[PDB]
């Protein structure tokens, strides 16, 4: 019966079943069938002047005509080929640049933060995902509710970097919130010679321990994969880091930024003590290299030389210097980072 | 909860027209009827026949001007005249609109044995009343 037929929208809404009890508490794709259809084209292959063929031909009005059986077979076959090509394009899969692992979000880039309302831009900043977590909350009515918590880091590769958390029901909304918020909570990280830290950093944030070592050029980033990601955003090229205790990603990130932001440059050390900061390099021999001098007056009394420093040592550093550190996992060959 | 002819609230990205934005209890209060004839007046006959004709004309025009209608049809009857007022888009070339007007008016006149006329009002896009 002609009167029992429905529209395409009604037919797809029922067949897809996107709405329903089955899709509420975790309990098929649409296709536009009017896409490649031309008004006037039918199975019989009639040529209606002014609708599916030109109205006038050679200055005269065309008359009703019909394609031959052979000529109509070509039109039908051509329409099926046009359909396969259109469908083939959709099956084509884009080549993803995977993150830390194939199915992880960590390490994947999200692009630059969105441009601000007042014509503000951040093309110089890159965004990286550090963690994606599905958090659940119990509600009175709906029960177990699902949400997304994301941790992203931003940086321009020249010392300015920051991180932020994003929360939303949808993952892409959490990505937007996180990276747009991180660009308003930027730290500035001092870098020695624009490639490493100024001195060894050892700190604890809550229960996460981070120990970072200043390294020479060519050493690379031998650190926790999340620290490597953040170092690339900051612009640090050479550093060693070891994470101990709790390996909480958020505590690791927050602890890393605290340590890197609270480091004393050589100029700050020269001004605080009113002395020259002299660098000694084994590749340059005994040549003393002044890296910083006090802007104010220069002291005349030498720094007291304590025969034995009462500094606390790390047993792992001492045990390694004495060749007593044995581990099949240390100093392994890895890809360039 | 009532469902009949109610476009349900969403995230604020669903454009709805004026007619679609009003539930049935607003008929005769904030929105008029899409068909006007004498069949439903007290003491008048042939309401059943006018109804079948209206249902067919709406399906006929929907499939005859595919993807062109920007709103529901307005069907008017005076004497034995039948006027069809439709709001269409400006995507098809004018030549095809003139072909379909001449074709549909003639076909419907012979089908229902009455003079039929089709009045087209074009709009650049679907007129949005609100975003639900």
């Amino acid at each position: 019966s002609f009167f029992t037929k429905l529209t395409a929208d009604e037919l797809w809404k029922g067949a897809l079943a996107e709405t329903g009890a089955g899709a509420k508490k975790g309990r098929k794709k649409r296709k536009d069938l009017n896409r490649g259809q031309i008004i006037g084209e039918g199975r019989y292959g009639f040529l209606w002047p002014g609708l599916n063929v030109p109205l006038m031909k050679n200055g005269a009005v065309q008359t009703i005509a019909q394609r031959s059986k052979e000529e109509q077979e070509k039109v039908e076959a051509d329409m099926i080929q046009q359909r396969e090509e259109w469908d083939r394009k959709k099956k084509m899969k884009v080549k993803r640049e995977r993150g830390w692992s194939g199915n992880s979000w960590g390490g994947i880039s999200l692009g630059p933060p969105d441009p601000g309302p007042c014509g503000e831009t951040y093309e110089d900043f890159d965004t990286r995902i550090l963690e994606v977590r599905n958090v659940f909350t119990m509600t009175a009515k709906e029960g177990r509710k699902k949400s997304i918590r994301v941790l992203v880091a931003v940086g321009n590769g020249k010392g300015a970097a920051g991180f932020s958390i994003g929360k939303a029901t949808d993952r892409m909304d959490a990505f937007r919130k996180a990276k747009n918020r991180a660009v308003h909570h930027l730290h500035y990280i001092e870098r020695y010679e624009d490639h490493t830290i100024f001195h060894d950093i050892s700190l604890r944030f809550k229960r996460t321990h981070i120990k970072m070592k200043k390294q020479p050029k060519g050493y690379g980033l031998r650190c926790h994969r999340a620290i490597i990601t953040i170092c690339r955003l900051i612009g640090i090229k050479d550093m060693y880091a070891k994470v101990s205790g709790s390996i909480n990603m958020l505590s690791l990130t927050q602890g890393l930024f605290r340590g890197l932001s609270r480091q004393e440059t050589h100029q700050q050390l020269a001004d605080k003590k009113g002395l020259h900061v002299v660098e000694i390099r084994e590749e340059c021999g005994p040549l003393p290299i002044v890296v910083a001098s006090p802007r104010g007056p220069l002291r005349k009394d030498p720094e007291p030389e304590d025969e034995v420093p009462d500094v606390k040592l790390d047993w792992e550093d001492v045990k390694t210097a004495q060749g007593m550190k044995r581990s099949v996992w240390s100093n392994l060959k890895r890809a360039a980072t | 909860k009532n469902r009949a002819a109610r476009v349900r609230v969403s995230k604020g990205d669903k454009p709805v027209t004026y007619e679609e934005a009003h539930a049935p209890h607003y008929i005769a209060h904030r929105k008029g009827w899409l068909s006007l004839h004498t069949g439903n007046l007290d003491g008048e006959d042939h309401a059943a026949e006018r109804t079948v004709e209206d249902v067919f004309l709406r399906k006929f025009m929907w499939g005859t001007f595919p993807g062109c209608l920007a709103d529901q049809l307005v069907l008017k009857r005076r004497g034995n005249q039948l006027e069809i007022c439709a709001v269409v888009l400006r995507q098809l070339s004018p030549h095809k609109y003139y072909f379909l007007v001449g074709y549909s008016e003639t076909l419907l006149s012979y089908f229902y044995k009455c003079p039929v006329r089709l009045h087209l009002q074009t709009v650049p896009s679907k007129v949005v009343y609100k975003y639900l």
Partner: peptide
Amino acid sequence: RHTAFVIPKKNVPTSKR
């Protein structure tokens, strides 16, 4: 297979007073 698919999109200009 992999499902960590990033798919960027922006809301529609449906927020204008």
